[PDB]
Design a protein around this nucleic acid. Sequence first.
DNA 1: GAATAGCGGAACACATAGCCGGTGCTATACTTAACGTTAATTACTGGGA
DNA 2: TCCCAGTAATTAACGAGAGCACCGGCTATGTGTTCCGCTATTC
Lengths: 49, 278, 79, 1336, 49
Amino acid sequence: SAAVKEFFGSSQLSQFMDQNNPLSEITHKRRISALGPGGLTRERAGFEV
Amino acid sequence: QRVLDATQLYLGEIGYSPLLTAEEEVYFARRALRGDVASRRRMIESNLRLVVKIARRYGNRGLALLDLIEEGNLGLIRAVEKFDPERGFRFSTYATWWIRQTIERAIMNQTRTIRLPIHIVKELNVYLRTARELSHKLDHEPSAEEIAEQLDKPVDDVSRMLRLNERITSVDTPLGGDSEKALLDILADEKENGPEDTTQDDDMKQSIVKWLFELNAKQREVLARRFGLLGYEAATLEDVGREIGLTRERVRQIQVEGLRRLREILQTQGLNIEALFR
Amino acid sequence: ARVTVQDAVEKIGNRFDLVLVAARRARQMQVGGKDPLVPEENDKTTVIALREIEEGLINNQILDVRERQEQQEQEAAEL
Amino acid sequence: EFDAIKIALASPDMIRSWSFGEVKKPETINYRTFKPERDGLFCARIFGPVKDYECLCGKYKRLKHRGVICEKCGVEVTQTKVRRERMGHIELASPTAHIWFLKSLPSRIGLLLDMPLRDIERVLYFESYVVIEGGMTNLERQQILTEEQYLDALEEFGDEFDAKMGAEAIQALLKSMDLEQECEQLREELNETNSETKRKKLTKRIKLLEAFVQSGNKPEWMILTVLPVLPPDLRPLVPLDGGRFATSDLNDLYRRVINRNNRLKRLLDLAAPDIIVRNEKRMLQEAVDALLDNGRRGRAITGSNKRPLKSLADMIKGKQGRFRQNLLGKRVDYSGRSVITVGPYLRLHQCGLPKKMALELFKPFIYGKLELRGLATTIKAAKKMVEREEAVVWDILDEVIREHPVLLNRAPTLHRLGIQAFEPVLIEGKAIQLHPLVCAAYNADFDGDQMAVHVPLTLEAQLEARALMMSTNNILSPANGEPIIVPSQDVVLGLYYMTRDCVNAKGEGMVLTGPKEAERLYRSGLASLHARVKVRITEYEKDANGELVAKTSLKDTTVGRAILWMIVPKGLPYSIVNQALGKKAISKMLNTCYRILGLKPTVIFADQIMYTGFAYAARSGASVGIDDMVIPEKKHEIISEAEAEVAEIQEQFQSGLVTAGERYNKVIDIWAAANDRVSKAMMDNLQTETVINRDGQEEKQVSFNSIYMMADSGARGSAAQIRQLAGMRGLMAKPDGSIIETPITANFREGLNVLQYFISTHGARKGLADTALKTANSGYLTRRLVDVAQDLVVTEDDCGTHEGIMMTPVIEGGDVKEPLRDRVLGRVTAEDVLKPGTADILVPRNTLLHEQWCDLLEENSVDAVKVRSVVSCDTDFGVCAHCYGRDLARGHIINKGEAIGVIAAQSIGEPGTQLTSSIQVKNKGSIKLSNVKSVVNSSGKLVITSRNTELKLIDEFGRTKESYKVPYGAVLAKGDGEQVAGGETVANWDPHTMPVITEVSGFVRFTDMIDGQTITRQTDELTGLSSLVVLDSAERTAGGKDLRPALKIVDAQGNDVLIPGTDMPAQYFLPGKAIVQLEDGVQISSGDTLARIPQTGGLPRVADLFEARRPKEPAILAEISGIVSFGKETKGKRRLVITPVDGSDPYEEMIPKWRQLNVFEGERVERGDVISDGPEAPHDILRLRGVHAVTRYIVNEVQDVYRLQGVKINDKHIEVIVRQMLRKATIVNAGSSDFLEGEQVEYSRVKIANRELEANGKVGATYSRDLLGITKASLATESFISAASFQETTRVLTEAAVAGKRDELRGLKENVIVGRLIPAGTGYAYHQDRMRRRAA
Amino acid sequence: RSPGVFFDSDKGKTHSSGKVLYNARIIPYRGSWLDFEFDPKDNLFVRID
DNA sequence: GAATAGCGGAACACATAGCCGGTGCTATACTTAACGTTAATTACTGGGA
DNA sequence: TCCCAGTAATTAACGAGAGCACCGGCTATGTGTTCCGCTATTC
Ligand SMILES: [Mg+2]
Ligand SMILES: [Zn+2]
Ligand SMILES: [Zn+2]
């Protein structure tokens, strides 16, 4: 329970739904982010990705 | 040339003593308990691997590994201090009690930043064991009411002991995920007044002194020594009775008179009870 | 009644001796030991000080002379 | 109060003197009561009471009972803020080393002991015994022993030898160390040695030991024995709401250290076996060594959240430490922020403040006024008056706001125009109204950009913001003399629309009796705003000494240009508004008004310009519709032709005539041709599209098209965003940077398809990521530039020198890039600049060159002005006001005090977000080959025997408009000193054939030119000539390595042709890979080819020029003037023997043999000329050609980055960064002074120390100037705080603390930190008063 | 990034001669990494994590 | 005004009991722990001239 | 025998928004006294 709640509660990718449109909900759900666990960070993301 | 971390050096070191046989242990304790320090050194120096084996199980609590090992070492020194070979028992059975209990007391002591005592931590562990056994019966988190049901103890007691399991947070951890805002940016210095309340008090003090000198002398000396205000000490009506005006009833009378004059003086400046007390 | 301090800077150079002189003069007028020479137009003491600089009847020499004269007058009050 | 901050090592008895009790227990507080626990990390007998004037028992509770230590608790009643300033100390049971004096990489315990760090940490972790004064009975002093080695040595020596283990051993080393005798021994060994590595090593060890003697410290205080704890209110245990608590992470590490110290104490007291106490000391020492820093010694210990705890050194380092988060920039009361809007009715010193922010900020002033009016006799009533916002608290606010400037400021504050002052004007709103002319300065858009406001409270600050930071005072940029309040985007389009003419509007040809009848005509609708009308104007010149003289006239002009003329003040000539008056033509009116009239009728002029430009773009109705993008009709034809050509080339490539790389640049050629032809064929359709008729047929003219008037007038447009609205938008790139073949050929009016829109999206995601990373680099650049230029402050009025650099206009091969006039506008001379009639001084020696002396140079056409510069100023600690120059954002000379260092750092910092075969004379002048030897060739012309060959095109007036550089060996079609035409290919050469041409004539011989060893047989197989070509030394045998083919020349009469002028023989030893076509015994001429020899970033270029990094291929130079040769050639190293004519010959230099050399092994090279080619480091420029060469190299190589992007920056701002890079100058010979040989003392101090010695009878010091980069010259500073408030802090505090260093508080970051006035502006006279009254 | 072999080059300077040094890299979903980088002397060097 | 009496009652202190809180002790035997940069610079260390 | 090149470490990368005996010592706790204050009665 601690592991799965630690993911769903506060991971990098467990974000609030920006719920101030229908459009904002859809484009929050259809997001392709490259950060998080197993992904790079902003500081060392070169001009290629 | 060993790689110089503390754990590898220690765990490589402790193997330099052959483990002792039962008659060997008994003979070493016979020499040890009459005051031969070399026998104590041999007995404690050999069974260090027992301490690493026992304190291996107590890992991943609040203490790091080498802390657990070194606290087990203290109990091992206590164990050779009070071992009896005359019971004929193997030494490991008697020392296991001392090492296991002196690592258990270590985790009960040196874990929480606000040190809870022993009995409070044993009482909290009773409730956590009960909750772990109760969670498989109702497949949700057992409440404070549920643990108080299963142990038939008062609900306020179990609520208090679970609230003493707070897991005191850090300050320096950032908030919101983004590393720009820790609790130092959120917390406000609550005891220190800012300049507003600090200048209201000084202006109120000077205003009080001004209004008191606006009042006549016999009233304001009673009202000064009465509250310790105008450089005086807060005195009793009986005390200023014997000190200034012998009739205590007249001291009460002049106090009520001065309070009425000051009520008029305050309300002339528009400060009523609604003004000073909202 | 003041937008540009330029003529004051024409009187007192360096753009910084202006600020120190006008600060000393507005301390004279704010902590009310003094009164303005040129009339105030309901300006704050800062701007009356700058208009006094602009007429050229206040500078560091006038201030030091008047403070030394004030201390002489205060020493004449011993009796 | 205090003059200096002194830092030093803290003894184990100083620490017992700060402290107020020994923290003996780990436990922090109680748990039922929240009482601090006796006696752990929060106590009250130790650190003080928790409540003001109240004990822990509470039996003493008053200010009346102040000071008395209690009996039930031992708690001294005081204030409760004494818990921020009371320390406790832990007594460590064994000593443990301090991690800063052990692991900061030039390790002080290491290089103090001269013991390598691995051997020290093998002692501290109890692995190896180390001898401590065992004597040389068998062993060395600092020799370590492993355990069995120790055991057999102990068997051989039970006595007379002692080897301890651990921090007790290291402490016995340090306290057993002698300083004076060891320093004497190392000084003698430094005297005897000659290897420069060991010389530098002994210099460093000698300097560390000498600083240890001179400071009052001892070496053994590096080993902590008594550890001090922080006061409790600097690491609090604040209760959160709900019975919850939160700790600073120091309480955990302190609890860990106290726990292991208690357990070690009990382990010694139980007489444990030695393995357990050695493990326990290893475990402490580390709990400590973590507390002091986490992550240094191995991996950090972490908390519950799998994060490392914040240690002591973490609260100082980096952006989260005190130094750049809590101490340099602070959060500030009397402040607020909002969104901003326009409000263009303002005068330019005003700003809109809402009635809710202005009621909040000006709160204590309203209390102080409501007490004054009698409206509230107290503050408890005056608070509740402004709380409910009565009718009378809004009249008080209009008084207390009336002449009180506020301080508007945008968020990315770059330069000093990002914080300005405005007398506020109250708005019923929630936003900050803000004048339109100042958004150019703030770089503010009204797209939601937010600005913060600030209140100058004190009486000095209300004058500081009015005299220095008011908006009407800042009209010129500090970076250059350009104005900064220029009309931006709407006013200029309105002013363009007004100042025009059409060929037939209403009222054309009527005569007008003034610029006011022009208003009456237009407002009554009787003439258009563009009608060519004879008006009478009355313009005032001030030809005499301020005499405005009237002169009425009759000017043929417009009704718009006559309406506008009433806005123009008196002194300006009428011909400044008698044009189309676009954007450029306005800023050269609002600058001539500033120069002619002054400041005040320019600040009143810019408001009237804005008020007119808005009002006449209102009535302009200037829209933009979709018919305003006139797509050209020949676009289809051009695209059809260029689509035929690409298919033809595509057929030809399939026919094998061209490769892919040849059709690539042939298809990109036709598309870059048609992309131009489209954009040129639409510009004749845009601008001339008005074809109107006056009393007759038709007359073309400049168009009234709406998208032309928004790009022609410069108001928000160009000719490159157009051509993407009507013309084709050309070729596009790809993520490799390669250019896509098939370009995108649709404008934005015709729309793009799917593929053309996808192609032109890498170009946008490459540009957006560019501005994402660009700001992150440009912030760090100006962060470094400010801290390298802190303490530079205009401190004198004249340093009194006659040195200073020489200025020349920037002639970079073709035209003049920047002329002499714009380089030496506003900078005083160092010599008397005199006319080329050189018997008369044209200007005096120390005149300040404003415009009226610029034009006297512009008429007499002077080319070289020697100028006084910052980097040659002879001021100790500052820059003289003459040597700096003009104020540059004020027209006068620089005021004494004004801190040029920061304002010259920001002017380079803020533009950083805008960054990333034959010679033909093209003008009419005379050929001047400068300072170069060149012989007559066999064709009679001039061939080049010089390496630095420079072609000048000297005009008829003796100046240069076109300069050039010629390579070695080029035939000159012309001669020197004679006028040639344009288009003349004056010199010619092959870029591949390197001639090794002679200077003498006669029968050449192939002396020392033999085959099988030196040369080989590769004749002309194509023609039939016996070519005697040479192999290389890497392939030929070892019997002919140094035997080179020389060309000795004799005659047929038995005599030898030598070098004329001298007695030296004429031979030319050809190196390897030499292709000789001639023969021996055949006649050669002068200038005949003997052997035919074959051969950035925008922002990081600036960031590596100011850092002065070594480029990877340095141009190796001539370290001493003299003849050149080759010594014994190694395997890859050619030891270049440089023999002077008189000086020391044996300077040889190992050159990488694979690098292309340039000198022909026998030439007498001038000192500091190239040996190979490549970009040169400024270190070599400095050491060879001096300071005045590197100060021209850097300001040329960075102006060629800024002017490439069209950014103008005056050069003094780069000269002061150059001046701050070379503050350090190591010694060569110490002389009679008190310096060492190889040490790097700062040049300012050695400029005084030998100055008094030459003022004395003694001798000076010989010193070479040294250059450091801005990350090192800012980190090698005297004041240890302005270097620690920066990058690495644990290095600088440690290096200073072992040296007993002492900040003097003379810069600006230090006085900012300590909280007193900076020594720059208003706070300069007070620091002068302080430094005068002190030492008096 | 997809687990499996990944034959990146270097393609930078990284040598002071400009030679390219190809390196395989074997990323799993879970496990230790593995490279095979070349050396400038044409030596093939494994490295694990 | 003023003495005296009653009287609430607040509280303060003192003496106690009682109960938090720290400590010691337990006896088949038991024996070596827990997966990226980017660049620059500098100190170090094995290797070459 | 000193230079020199690969290797590893260190620094930097914007702004603002278990379980029982046992004892002792603290502390809550009755409780007395007491002291103050308040009121009420009477000369
Ligand atoms: Mg914007
Ligand atoms: Zn007390
Ligand atoms: Zn000077």
